[PDB]
Amino acid sequence: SNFTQFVLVDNGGTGDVTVAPSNFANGVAEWISSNSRSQAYKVTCSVRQSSAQNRKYTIKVEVPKVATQTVGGVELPVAAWRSYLNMELTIPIFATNSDCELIVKAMQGLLKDGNPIPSAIAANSGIY
Amino acid sequence: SNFTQFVLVDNGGTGDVTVAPSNFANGVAEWISSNSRSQAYKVTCSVRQSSAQNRKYTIKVEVPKVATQTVGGVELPVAAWRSYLNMELTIPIFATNSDCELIVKAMQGLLKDGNPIPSAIAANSGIY
Amino acid sequence: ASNFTQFVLVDNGGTGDVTVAPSNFANGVAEWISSNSRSQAYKVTCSVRQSSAQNRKYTIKVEVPKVATQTVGGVELPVAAWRSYLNMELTIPIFATNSDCELIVKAMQGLLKDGNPIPSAIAANSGIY
Amino acid sequence: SNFTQFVLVDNGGTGDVTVAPSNFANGVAEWISSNSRSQAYKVTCSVRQSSAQNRKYTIKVEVPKVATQTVGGVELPVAAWRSYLNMELTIPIFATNSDCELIVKAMQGLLKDGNPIPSAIAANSGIY
Amino acid sequence: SNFTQFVLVDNGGTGDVTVAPSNFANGVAEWISSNSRSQAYKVTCSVRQSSAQNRKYTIKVEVPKVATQTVGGVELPVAAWRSYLNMELTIPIFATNSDCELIVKAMQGLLKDGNPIPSAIAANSGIY
Amino acid sequence: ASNFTQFVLVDNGGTGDVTVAPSNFANGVAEWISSNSRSQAYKVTCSVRQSSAQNRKYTIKVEVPKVATQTVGGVELPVAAWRSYLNMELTIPIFATNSDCELIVKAMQGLLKDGNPIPSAIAANSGIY
Numbered sequence: 001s002n003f004t005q006f007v008l009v010d011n012g013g014t015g016d017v018t019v020a021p022s023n024f025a026n027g028v029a030e031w032i033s034s035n036s037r038s039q040a041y042k043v044t045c046s047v048r049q050s051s052a053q054n055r056k057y058t059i060k061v062e063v064p065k066v067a068t069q070t071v072g073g074v075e076l077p078v079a080a081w082r083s084y085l086n087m088e089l090t091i092p093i094f095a096t097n098s099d100c101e102l103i104v105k106a107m108q109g110l111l112k113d114g115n116p117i118p119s120a121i122a123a124n125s126g127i128y
Numbered sequence: 129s130n131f132t133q134f135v136l137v138d139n140g141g142t143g144d145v146t147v148a149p150s151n152f153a154n155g156v157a158e159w160i161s162s163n164s165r166s167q168a169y170k171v172t173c174s175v176r177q178s179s180a181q182n183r184k185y186t187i188k189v190e191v192p193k194v195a196t197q198t199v200g201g202v203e204l205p206v207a208a209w210r211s212y213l214n215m216e217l218t219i220p221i222f223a224t225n226s227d228c229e230l231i232v233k234a235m236q237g238l239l240k241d242g243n244p245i246p247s248a249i250a251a252n253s254g255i256y
Numbered sequence: 257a258s259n260f261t262q263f264v265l266v267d268n269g270g271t272g273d274v275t276v277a278p279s280n281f282a283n284g285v286a287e288w289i290s291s292n293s294r295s296q297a298y299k300v301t302c303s304v305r306q307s308s309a310q311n312r313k314y315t316i317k318v319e320v321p322k323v324a325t326q327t328v329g330g331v332e333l334p335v336a337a338w339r340s341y342l343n344m345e346l347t348i349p350i351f352a353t354n355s356d357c358e359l360i361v362k363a364m365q366g367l368l369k370d371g372n373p374i375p376s377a378i379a380a381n382s383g384i385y
Numbered sequence: 386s387n388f389t390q391f392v393l394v395d396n397g398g399t400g401d402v403t404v405a406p407s408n409f410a411n412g413v414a415e416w417i418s419s420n421s422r423s424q425a426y427k428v429t430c431s432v433r434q435s436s437a438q439n440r441k442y443t444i445k446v447e448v449p450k451v452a453t454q455t456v457g458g459v460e461l462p463v464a465a466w467r468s469y470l471n472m473e474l475t476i477p478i479f480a481t482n483s484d485c486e487l488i489v490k491a492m493q494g495l496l497k498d499g500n501p502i503p504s505a506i507a508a509n510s511g512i513y
Numbered sequence: 514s515n516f517t518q519f520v521l522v523d524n525g526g527t528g529d530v531t532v533a534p535s536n537f538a539n540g541v542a543e544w545i546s547s548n549s550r551s552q553a554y555k556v557t558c559s560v561r562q563s564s565a566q567n568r569k570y571t572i573k574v575e576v577p578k579v580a581t582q583t584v585g586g587v588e589l590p591v592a593a594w595r596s597y598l599n600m601e602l603t604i605p606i607f608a609t610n611s612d613c614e615l616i617v618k619a620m621q622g623l624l625k626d627g628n629p630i631p632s633a634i635a636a637n638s639g640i641y
Numbered sequence: 642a643s644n645f646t647q648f649v650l651v652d653n654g655g656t657g658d659v660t661v662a663p664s665n666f667a668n669g670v671a672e673w674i675s676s677n678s679r680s681q682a683y684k685v686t687c688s689v690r691q692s693s694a695q696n697r698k699y700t701i702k703v704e705v706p707k708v709a710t711q712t713v714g715g716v717e718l719p720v721a722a723w724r725s726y727l728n729m730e731l732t733i734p735i736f737a738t739n740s741d742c743e744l745i746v747k748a749m750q751g752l753l754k755d756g757n758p759i760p761s762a763i764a765a766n767s768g769i770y
Contacts, residue, residue, distance in 0.1 A: 001256065002244040002247060002248065002255060002256060003244075003255060003256070004244075006243055006244060007237065008234060008237055008238075009230065009233060009234055009237065010233070010237055029255045043238075045244070045245060045248075045255055046254075046255075047248070047254030047255065055254075057245070057248075057249065057254075059238070059245055061234060061235075061238065063230070063231060063234055065227075067331050067332070069329075069330040069331060070330055071330050078330075078331070080331040080332070080333065081220050081222060081331075081333075083218070083219060083220065083223070083227075083231055084218055085217055085218075085231075085234075085235065085238075086215075086216050087214075087215060087238075088214050089213055089249060090211070090212055090213075091211060091249065091252070092209050092211065094209060095211070095252060096252065097250060097251055097252055099193075099211075099252075100249050100250040100251060100252045101250035101251075102137065102191070102250075103191060103211055103213075103249055103250070104239065104241075104246035104247075104249045104250040105137060105138070105250075106136060106137055106189060106191055106213075107189075107213065107239040107246065107249070108236070108239040108240060108241065108246065109135065109136055109137065109138055110136075110171075110187070110189065110213075110215075110239075111232065111235040111236040111238075111239060112236060113232075113236065115134055116130040116131075116132075116134060116173070117173060117185070117187055118232035118235065118236065119130060119232075120130065120173075120175070120185075121185065121217060121219065121228050121231055121232045121235070122225060122228040122229035122230075122231070122232040122233075123225055123228060123229075123279075123291075124219070124223060124224065124225055124227075124228045124289075124292075124293060124294050124297075125279035125280065125289060126174075126175030126183075126185075126279060126280045126282065127130060127131060127157045127173055127174075127175065127280065127281070127282070128129065128130060128131070128260070128278045128279050128280045128281045128286075128287065129258060129260060129278070131281070131770055132514065132770065133514070148765070148767040148768075148770070149540075149767070149768055149770040150560060150767060150768045151540055151559075151560065151561055151562075151768060152281070152282075152539060152540025153539060153540060153561065154283070155282030155283045157282075157540075160766070160767070162610060162765060162766055162767070163609055163610055163766065164606065164607055164608060164609050164766075165562075165568060165606035165607075165608075165766065166606045166607055168766075174282070175280070175282070183294070200711050200712040200713065201709075201710050201711060201712045201717065202709045202710070202711050202720075202722055203709070204607050204722065205607055205609065206607075221293065221294045221295045222293055222295055222333050222334055222335075223293055223294075224292065224293045224334070225291055225292075225293075227293075257517075257518075257533070257534065258513050258534070259501050259504050259505050259508075259510065259512060259513060260501060260512045260513060260537075261501055263494070263497070263499070263500035263501055264494050264497070264500075265491050265494045265495060266487060266490045266491045266494050267490060267493070267494050267497070268490070274491065274494075281512065281537070281538070283539065284538030284539045285538075286501075286511070286512035286538075288501075298491070300495065300502070302501075302502050302505070302511075302512060303511075303538070304505075304511045304536070304538075308464075309591070310464065310465060310551075310591070311464060312550065314506060316495075316502060318491065318492065318495055320487070320488050320491050322477070322479070322480070322484065337477075337479065338438070338477035338479055338480070339477075340474065340475060340476050340477065340480065340484075340488050341473070341474070341475040342472065342473065342474050342475075342492060342495075343471075343472065343473040343474075343475075344470065344471070344472045344473075345469075345470070345471040345472075346468065346469065346470045346471075346506070347468060347469040348468045349450060349464060349465045349466065349467070349468070350465075350549065350550040350551040351450065351465050351466075351549055351550075351551045351585075351586070351587045351588075352450050352452070352468065352509075352549055352550075353452040353548070353549040353585045354507070354508065354509060354547065354548075354549075355451065355452050355585075356448075356450045356451055356452050356468070356549075357506060357507050357508070357509055358507050359394065359448060359449075359451055360448045360468045360470075360506065361496075361503050361506050361507045362394040362395065362396075363393050363394050363402070363426060363446060363448045363470075364446065364470060364496055364503075365395075365496055365497075365498075365503070366391075366392055366393040366394050366395050366402075367393060367428060367444070367446055368489070368492055368493055368496065369391075369392075369395070369493075370493075371391070372391040372392075373387045373388060373389060373391055373414070373416075373430070374428070374430045374444060375489050375492075375493075376387050377387050377430065377432070378442060378474065378485060378488070378489055379482065379485050379486050379489050380387075380482065380485075381480075381482060381485060382387075382432075383412065383414070383430075383431065383432045384387060384388050384414030384430050384431075385386060385387070385388055385409075385414075452549075452585035452586075453583060453584070453585040453586040453587075460587075465587050466587070508535070509535065509545065509549070509550055509553075510534075510535035510536060510545070511535060511536035511537070511538055511543075512536075512537065512538070513516070513534045513535065513536055513537040513543075514770060515758045515761050515762050515765075515767075515769060515770070516758060516769050516770055517758060519751075519754075519756070519757040519758055520751055520754075520757075521748050521751040521752060522744065522747040522748050522751050523747065523750075523751050523754070524747075530748070530751075537770075540768065542758070542768070542769030542770075544758075554748060556752060556759070558758070558759045558762065558768075558769050559768065559769075560762070560767075560768045566723070570763060572752070572759060574748060574749065574752055576741075576744060576745045576748045577744075578734060578736065578737050578741045579740065579741055579744055580737070580738040580740050580741050592693075592695065592696060592734060593695060593734045593735075593736050594734065594736075595734070596731065596732060596733045596734070596737065596741070596745045597730075597731065597732040598729065598730070598731045598745075598748075598749060599728075599729070599730040599731075600727065600728065600729045600730075601726070601727065601728040601729075602725065602726070602727050602728075602763065603725060603726040603727075603728075604725050605707070605722075605723035605724075605725065607707070607722065607723055608707070608723070608725065608766075610764065610765065610766060612707065612725075613763060613764050613765075613766060614764050615651060615705070616705050616725050616763070617753070617760050617763055617764050618651045618652060618653070619650050619651045619659065619683070619703065619705050620703065620727060620753055620760075621652070621753055621754075621755075621760075622648070622649050622650045622651050622652050622659075623650060623685065623701075623703055623727075624746075624749055624750055624753065625648070625649070625652070625750075626750075627648070628648035628649075629644050629645060629646055629648055629671075629673075629687075630685070630687050630701060631746050631749075631750070632644050633644050633687070633689075634699060634731070634742060634745065634746050635739070635742050635743050635746045636644075636739065636742070637737075637739060637742055638644065639671070639687075639688075639689045640644060640645045640666065640671035640687060641643050641644060641645060
């Protein structure tokens with residue numbers, strides 16, 4: 001079973017962010033981190049047959065900024081802002097397991113450390 | 129300069145797929161692999177100020193299936209089909225370099241080998 | 257041999273220097289930003305174009321922010337209290353050689369040298385008299 | 386009082402270009418070199434309250450083309466022999482003296498020898 | 514990386530004309546010589562997908578008139594002192610690397626010394 | 642002393658050379674073609690005209706075919722799968738001497754010399770970066 005707990009942010013043993021399964025309603029699997037829901041990481045994944053020849057994956061990730069809100073003397077654990085990631089992967093039904101492995105490898109290499117796109121994202125910049 | 133050649137598919141030295149810069153028109157950087165354009169990998173990236181508080185990255189990747197087409201005795205190098213990846217990353221302007229690095233790390237960990245989503249993609253399956 | 261490199265924008269003598277690094281070249285505009293959030297970052301942009309048939313125009317913009325922390329809806333956010341804007345437009349004839357461009361650069365450097373009238377007036381919130 | 390003469394182009398003691406006060410009409414300070422008005426270095430500076438929250442410095446510099454020039458001759462067209470710098474500095478009214486010193490330091494560091502922008506200007510090139 | 518300087522006019526080691534990178538705005542590579550912009554050799558190159566089946570290379574070369582020229586002077590009219598070459602190369606997307614090498618060889622052989630077209634150009638003549 | 646002669650268009654080192662020979666001069670356009678059927682032949686055209694009162698313009702076109710055999714209605718025919726087109730337009734002022742034209746020719750030759758940026762980019766299906 002792949003509907004299990006996994007590490008979303010690997011900080012080297014200490015400080016790791018883990019998300020656990022929370023809901024599987026309407027075919028949308030959902031992972032939520034522990035502690036307060038207002039300051040929790042969210043991961044959702046769903047796969048559907050978009051067209052007669054294509055299968056589409058929909059993956060969403062929310063990264064919160066942990067902060068404390070004080071209104072009228074009442075303190076609440078909230079998120080100052082959230083970063084939203086929207087992924088849509090379309091794979092034809094003719095793709096074998098090797099083709100899917102190659103697609104996954106391409107996706108992993110797109111965001112590997114030192115590559116242009118992750119470096120631009122991590123530096124609050126674009127392509128220069 | 130990050131508008132350089134990089135390895136898209138790492139096959140361990142031999143068989144690696146490399147994409148080189150080809151166009152930067154209208155603010156959209158483009159990478160294309162060597163040899164025939166019809167059977168070439170394509171990577172495009174662009175960053176824009178979507179709203180007053182958010183910056184949006186748009187990344188597209190096309191993975192072709194190399195094949196030979198023979199119509200009337202004429203052989204042409206074509207792609208039997210293509211796999212399309214569409215990524216849209218929205219980052220608030222309040223994010224520092226550390227926040228962008230954390231976002232990049234989350235994106236990398238989403239597609240790391242052994243994790244649910246890449247395993248599902250590489251196995252021609254969904255979440256079970 | 258590319259000239260799109262990082263440089264020290266504000267020289268504070270080693271410690272506290274403000275450094276801007278290349279960040280964008282989309283639409284023909286080269287951009288430098290500092291290692292801060294983009295709501296608090298120094299920004300430098302430069303572009304060159306053929307304005308007329310016999311003229312070339314440089315457009316250089318510099319943004320100097322005043323960093324502050326603002327509480328919006330009970331949450332503290334890194335913002336800039338205000339921003340200082342520098343707009344430079346340099347028109348050079350196509351007949352000017354490298355020595356003429358060096359002369360222009362030297363004139364621009366000497367215009368803002370420490371001790372000269374204009375920088376002293378700017379640094380003292382006063383005019384020229 | 387700061388309306389004094391200064392060295393505009395420093396050539397190491399010999400060959401220096403010195404601009405001296407020449408006009409103060411309408412409160413606008415003007416400096417010119419010991420040349421004809423068609424071949425002289427001209428510097429003008431003025432400051433005004435542009436908006437309710439900002440003060441604006443207007444600095445204009447004129448640099449003659451020296452290569453293959455005839456001293457004291459009629460050189461036409463004018464646009465082919467003169468370089469124009471139009472600098473506008475907007476400072477919010479909340480800036481103290483130290484903030485203005487920091488702004489001046491930033492302006493000085495923008496045009497320091499070896500930095501990208503002055504190197505590009507001095508080489509008849511852009512950013513590459 | 515291929516955006517480097519090269520010898521545009523080869524004069525046997527001495528008197529060679531070398532063009533160096535000067536601009537990369539909008540993804541268009543530009544080379545100029547160590548002259549004023551009105552008397553310099555300029556080379557620009559860019560490639561784009563012109564149609565659904567073709568890629569187009571746009572190469573532009575500017576050559577100054579050297580006979581009875583004044584180095585660093587104002588020479589008017591401009592059209593009487595500059596030669597313009599506008600080269601467009603359309604390559605179908607089915608062409609491999611070897612096909613592009615053959616096309617490059619054909620282009621080189623078109624302008625080789627002793628061939629009709631270069632001889633006609635160098636003698637201010639047509640085809641007779 | 643006529644310059645309307647045949648020349649090697651693609652030099653493959655003696656063997657496999659592509660040679661184009663004069664074939665037409667109708668309407669003021671000189672044409673070279675290779676020793677193939679005209680559906681599979683290399684084509685080179687050149688023409689010069691007085692574009693303006695003080696300018697002369699050269700128009701040079703080169704066609705590089707990709708040969709193939711196509712079956713149309715059950716019959717095999719020699720065709721070209723696709724064709725690569727080169728369009729060159731050279732404007733020279735009437736005041737340019739023979740030395741200036743030689744300079745232009747040398748610049749054109751050095752632009753496409755092996756090892757230079759543009760030919761390397763063309764031969765690698767890539768741009769300049």
